[PDB]
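[User] At your convenience, examine this fold.
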Amino acid sequence: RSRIFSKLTLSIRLAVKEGGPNPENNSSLANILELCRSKNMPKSTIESALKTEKNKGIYLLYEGRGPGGSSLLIEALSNSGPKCHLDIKYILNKNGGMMAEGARHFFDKKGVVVVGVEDREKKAVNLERALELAIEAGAEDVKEAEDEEEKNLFKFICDASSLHQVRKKLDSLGLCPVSCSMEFIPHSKVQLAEPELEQAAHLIQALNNYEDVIHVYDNIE
């Protein structure tokens, strides 16, 4: 799909800015390229994204408010910050939201280590034990989650800086880290009703449809 390919181009460009255009030296870029190939993105399109100048485009993070007092984080890569800012504000405003003024940083980038509910010794890890190990590893928060199977899991949240150390300590303490990742976490969440939920989805969809948007984050529970 052409919209998918446009987003995947933005992701290639952002990965080249962070680690260079050689996927042998940039594992994040290598993962994106694999996904591109899995979606049947033509080589010509991949190469054009790969060979775009590292200095082209501005990476942008805009905060806004949606329907029911929700909070939004709009992640974008644009050739014109002013057009992108005006356009995102227009999309927010036309769908009942608003652009947050100033330096409201309602979302924080955080590290996230996912780990299974079983020790190296294949013994159960209950929440109380996950919490004690989180203290010892320097994790800021622990969430109980489920994957698509489904099956139980633990999400250990930390300072984005410390992602490296925490995964390592969790492994040294006997836990089984499945995956590492960066996520944008809001300070608090809101609950929306049905009329507000459908509106929020409409606004989010409109923002995802904008050409420069990579991702939209929200605090809707």
Summary: Residues 106-188 form one domain.
